[PDB]
Amino acid sequence: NFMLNQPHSVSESPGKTVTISCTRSSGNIDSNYVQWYQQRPGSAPITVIYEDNQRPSGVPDRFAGSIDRSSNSASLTISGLKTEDEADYYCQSYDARNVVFGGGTRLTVLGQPKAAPSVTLFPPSSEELQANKATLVCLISDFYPGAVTVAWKADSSPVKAGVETTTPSKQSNNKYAASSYLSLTPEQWKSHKSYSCQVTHEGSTVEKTVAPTEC
Amino acid sequence: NFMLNQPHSVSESPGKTVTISCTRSSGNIDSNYVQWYQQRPGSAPITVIYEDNQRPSGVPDRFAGSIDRSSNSASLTISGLKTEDEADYYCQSYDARNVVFGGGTRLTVLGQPKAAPSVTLFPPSSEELQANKATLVCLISDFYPGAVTVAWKADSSPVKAGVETTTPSKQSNNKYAASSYLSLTPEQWKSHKSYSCQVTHEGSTVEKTVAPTEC
Ligand SMILES: Cc1c(CN2CCOCC2)c(=O)oc2cc(OC[C@@H](C)c3ccccc3)ccc12
């Protein structure tokens, strides 16, 4: 079947308009209806759009669904942004019994100034190595909003095996920190020329690389 | 409109059976298909039941959906309860005028065993020292329950400045992870013999120590 591709995050100040795209991988966006669901943090989801642009009763007309056949995409547009619009937004369609969801888009209504993350990539420590561990840590500090995406590369190939990322937490400077760790064996860590941590925040992606050496 | 009413919370111990009910307020439960979604906190949800009782590929056969017309309810029944089943569960049906979700049910799996944290201390990266920074990270993974206290030492004396610890977050092994980082100048780092990270969990302390390495 097809995928539905949503940006990981979006942000704006109160009173502004924000748009969340939902691109269909293969086939025609207009072949099947698209729904949008809102989840506020610590809340149950609710439908804000069904059948591309239908608004259920109780959902203000600040929320608007559209289809662009040229780009093969759905969009949810929210005008007059209010703090309660801060939530995760998922688009959803079908082909046959195949329900297809997007990955979700975290919408932040800016409570403070944007801050790009400090990203530090650490190669394995001597002590963990002699315990037969080559865990790498990617430390991500001092960012707002609190939404990041982390991907790892062995040389050039995406890694999915062994990646863990913490949920961003508010630190004493009122900015967010989190860590991504890749649990490698020594044999894996040494069997490559370099590893990489790619951090995406506010659509902007930074990339750090470490290589094996001996000191 | 109609509403789907779920319990707020249920608790049960491993290997036992738990049942979550989803009562339709008006209309017959069987007029429309019920879905069940599982959400681990900080994650996108996954479909665990569709069409009242159909399990997607990769959902364990311990998850069973049912309909009871007389009590106008849907139920999700989890057999052989495991710790990874700790999550929020949401039912969902159709209004033709809407997609409606229940308020969701937090499933607590009682009697999870203690797990001591795995602790890995990383000295400053080379590249970071070239950019005039000397952050140390202490990775704390695989611990239950999800509370730790971290103290840092410069040589043998307490470090009272530049320490941050992330809020522990449940990872895919259903154990917690967190990082403590110490923001030092290159000067502070080279002026000491060593720095230590001391992690206390359930009364047991684990201490790790790194030193400026020479090549
Ligand atoms: C992506 C996805 C899947 C597919 N998974 C992906 C990973 O591999 C297993 C299948 C999937 O099976 O189900 C998904 C359901 C999604 O959202 C449902 C919405 C209405 C909801 C439910 C509960 C709380 C908040 C929101 C969103 C995404 C999914």
* Residues of chain B positioned with their CB less than 8 A from the CB of A181: 139, 141, 177
* Residues of chain B positioned with their CB less than 8 A from the CB of A210: 125
Are B187 and B138 within one domain? yes
Looking at chain B, the number of H-run helices and the number of E-run strands are 2, 19
SS3 for A127-150 is HHHCCCCCCEEEEEEEEECCCCEE
User: For residue B8, what is the enclosing H or E element?
Assistant: none
The answer to whether A169 and A175 are in contact (CB under 8 A) is no
The answer to whether A75 and A66 are in contact (CB under 8 A) is yes
Domain limit, last residue, from A109, A126, A153? A109
Are A90 and A136 within one domain? no
**Three-state SS at B84:** helix
The answer to whether B177 and B171 are in contact (CB under 8 A) is yes
Domain assignment present for residue B137? The answer is yes
Other C-beta atoms within 10 Å of A60: how many? 12
CB–CB contact B164 A177 (8 Å): yes
Query: Which residue type occupies B33?
Result: Y
Quote the CA–CA distance of A114 and A142 in Å, as a whole number. 10
| Nearest ligand 1 atom, CA A39 | 25
Our CA-based measurement puts residue B119 at a distance from the nearest CA of chain A, in whole angstroms, of: 9
* Residues of chain A positioned with their CB less than 8 A from the CB of B41: 167
Domain limit, last residue, from B109, B133, B166? B109
CATH number at residue B165: 2.60.40.10
Q: What is the DSSP letter of B107?
A: E
A178 CB burial (10 A radius; 0-12, 13-18, 19+) = buried
Domain assignment present for residue A22? The answer is yes
Quote the CA–CA distance of A135 and A100 in Å, as a whole number. 34
Phi and psi (nearest 5°) for A129? -55, -45
Nearest-5° Cα angle at A97, A92 to A101: 20
Facing residues of B152 across strands? B197
Domain that holds residue A25: 4-109
- Nearest one of A119, A130, A175 to A152, comparing CA atoms: A119
Are B101 and B10 within one domain? yes
User: What is the b/e burial string over B50-59, where b = at least 16 CB atoms within 10 angstroms of the residue's CB?
Assistant: bebbebeeeb
Are A162 and A105 within one domain? no
Q: Whose CA is nearest to atom 25 of ligand 1?
A: A45
> Parallel, antiparallel, or unpaired for β B157-158 and B99-101?
unpaired
The answer to whether A151 and A207 are in contact (CB under 8 A) is no
Domain assignment present for residue B80? The answer is yes
Are A10 and A94 within one domain? yes
Domain limit, last residue, from B109, B142, B171? B109
Are B144 and B89 within one domain? no
Q: What domain count does chain A have?
A: 2
Residues in B 14-33 with any Cβ partner in A closer than 8 A: none
DSSP string, B159-207: P-SSEEEPPPEE-TTSSEEEEEEE---HHHHHTSS-EEEEEEETTEEEE
Are B70 and B124 within one domain? no
Q: Give the distance from CA A134 to its chain's centroid.
A: 26
**Three-state SS at A189:** helix
**Three-state SS at A31:** helix
- The CA–CA distances, whole Å, from B135 to A138, B51, B195, B199 equal 12, 52, 11, 18
CB–CB contact A103 B210 (8 Å): no
Instruction: Say if ligand 1 is within 6 A of residue B47 CB.
Output: yes
- A103 CB near a chain B CB, below 8 Å? yes
Phi-psi region of A162 (alpha: psi -120 to 50; beta: other; left: phi over 0): left
Domain assignment present for residue A215? The answer is no
Quote the CA–CA distance of A137 and A140 in Å, as a whole number. 10
Q: Whose CA is nearest to atom 16 of ligand 1?
A: B45
Quote the CA–CA distance of B57 and B35 in Å, as a whole number. 15
Pocket probe mutation, ligand 1, options B22, B37, B94, B107, max atoms within 8 Å of Cβ: B37
**CB < 8 Å & 24+ apart, contacts of B93-96:** B93/B4, B93/B24, B93/B29, B93/B32, B93/B33, B93/B34, B93/B35, B94/B32, B94/B33, B95/A56, B95/B1, B95/B2, B95/B32
Are B28 and B82 within one domain? yes
- Nearest one of A126, A118, A146, A166 to B179, comparing CA atoms: A166
- Resolution (angstroms) stands at 2.1
Are A136 and A60 within one domain? no
Cβ-Cβ contacts under 8 Å for B161 (sequence gap 6 or more): none
Domain assignment present for residue B148? The answer is yes
Are B155 and B76 within one domain? no
DSSP string, B113-175: PPBPPEEEEEPPPHHHHHTT---EEEEEEEEBSS--EEEEEETTEEP-SSEEEPPPEE-TTSS
Cβ-Cβ contacts under 8 Å for B189 (sequence gap 6 or more): B123, B124, B129, B134, B136, B195, B212
Domain assignment present for residue A50? The answer is yes
- Nearest one of B170, B164, B165, B202 to B183, comparing CA atoms: B164
Are B196 and B101 within one domain? no
Are A183 and A124 within one domain? yes
Cβ-Cβ contacts under 8 Å for A39 (sequence gap 6 or more): A45, A87, A88, A90
Domain assignment present for residue B23? The answer is yes
Cβ-Cβ contacts under 8 Å for A157 (sequence gap 6 or more): none
Residue B191's Cβ-side half-sphere holds a number of Cα atoms within 13 Å equal to 7
CB–CB contact A101 B44 (8 Å): yes
Domain assignment present for residue B215? The answer is no
Quote the CA–CA distance of A62 and B169 in Å, as a whole number. 34
